[PDB]
A paper describes a structure:
The eukaryotic translation initiation factor 4E (eIF4E) protein is a vital component of the cap-dependent mechanism for mRNA translation. It binds the 7-methylguanosine (m7G) cap structure present at the 5′ end of mRNA molecules and recruits it as part of the eIF4F assembly which also includes two other partner proteins, eIF4A and eIF4G, to the translational machinery for protein synthesis. We have used a structure-guided approach to rationally develop a set of hydrocarbon stapled-peptides with high binding affinities and residence times against the oncogenic eukaryotic translation initiation factor 4E (eIF4E) protein. Crystal structures of these peptides in complex with eIF4E show that they form specific interactions with a region on the protein-binding interface of eIF4E which is distinct from the other well-established canonical interactions.
Two 15mer peptide derivatives of sTIP-05 (sTIP-09: 1KKRYSR*QLL*FRRR15 and sTIP-10: 1KKRYSREQLL*FQR*15) were synthesized, one with an “13RRR15” sequence extension and the other with an i, i + 4 hydrocarbon staple shifted to positions 11 and 15 of the peptide sequence which encapsulates the “12FQR14” sequence at the C-terminus. Significantly though, their rates of dissociation decreased relative to sTIP-05 and hence residence times were improved (68 seconds for sTIP-09 and 39 seconds for sTIP-10). The guanidinium group of R13 was involved in cation–pi interactions with residues W73, Y76 and hydrogen-bond interaction with the side-chain of N77. For R14, only the backbone atoms were visible while no clear density was seen for R15. We computationally generated a complete model of the sTIP-09 peptide using the crystal structure as a template and subjected the complex to MD simulations. The simulated trajectory showed that R13 was relatively stable, remained in contact with the protein residues (albeit via an unstable R13–N77 hydrogen-bond, occupancy < 10%) and hence, contributed favorably (–2.2 kcal mol–1) to binding along with the other core residues (Y4, R6, L9, L10 and F12; –1.7 to –7.3 kcal mol–1) in the peptide. R14 and R15 did not interact stably with the protein and this was also reflected in the absence of any significant energetic contributions from these residues. They were highly dynamic, corroborating the lack of density in the crystal structure, similar to that seen for the “ButPhI” functional group in &13.
Numbering used by the authors:
A (entry chain B): 2 to 15
B (entry chain A): 27 to 217
Write the structure that this text describes.
């Protein structure tokens, strides 16, 4: 299963 | 040897999601006013979508965004919604400015990130209703009698939104909302 933290999601925007 | 996937793969989501738009046009039916925008299943594809679309606070009165798991339509009559319900966030006219867009992005991130631990499978989607009378954001879950799941989802969502203990939010089954006498629907749960 794939879980992303909020932080991780924002970082992957860059 | 092959290339290291870390260097070039998009980061997959657990689910494929679909973003929908409801256009307020009283000359057309509800069905004709609800359309798919597009679907995505990676973090990078989510941002490509989010980055190019209007913020909820800039939509015309009466319009909605909805983000639902692929194959669930954003209507309570869908098989996965009919026995379900929603955690409802009501915003006053001042919160349009201070909270609507932050709360909606937080909501999207909760969904795509699978932020509900062991209860992520109960989540169907979320809706933001942009309304002159007051905006609403809701997370929709699949079964209103899954007390453990619904309560867990609520606490997670409340804390992700950063609402203080003083603030109380409610969960309402879609059936109860549909059959409500008067303006207010009774809460099956509160957190």
């Amino acid at each position: 299963k794939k879980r992303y933290s909020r932080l991780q999601l924002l970082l992957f925007r860059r | 040897e092959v290339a290291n996937p870390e260097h070039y793969i998009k980061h997959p989501l657990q689910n494929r999601w679909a973003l929908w738009f409801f256009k307020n046009d009283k000359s057309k039916t509800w069905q004709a006013n609800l359309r798919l925008i597009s679907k995505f299943d990676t973090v990078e594809d989510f941002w490509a979508l989010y980055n190019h679309i209007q913020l909820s606070s800039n939509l015309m009165p009466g319009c909605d965004y909805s983000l639902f798991k692929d194959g669930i339509e954003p209507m309570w009559e869908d098989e996965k919604n009919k026995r379900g319900g929603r955690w409802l966030i009501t915003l006053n006219k001042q919160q349009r400015r201070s909270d609507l867009d932050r709360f909606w992005l937080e909501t999207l991130l909760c969904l795509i990130g699978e932020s509900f631990d062991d209860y992520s499978d109960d989540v169907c989607g979320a809706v933001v209703n942009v309304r002159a009378k007051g905006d609403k954001i809701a997370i929709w879950t699949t079964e209103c009698e899954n007390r453990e799941a619904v309560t867990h989802i609520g606490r997670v969502y409340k804390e992700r939104l950063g609402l203080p203990p003083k603030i109380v939010i409610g969960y309402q089954s879609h059936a109860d909302t549909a059959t409500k006498s008067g303006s207010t629907t009774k809460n099956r749960f509160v957190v």
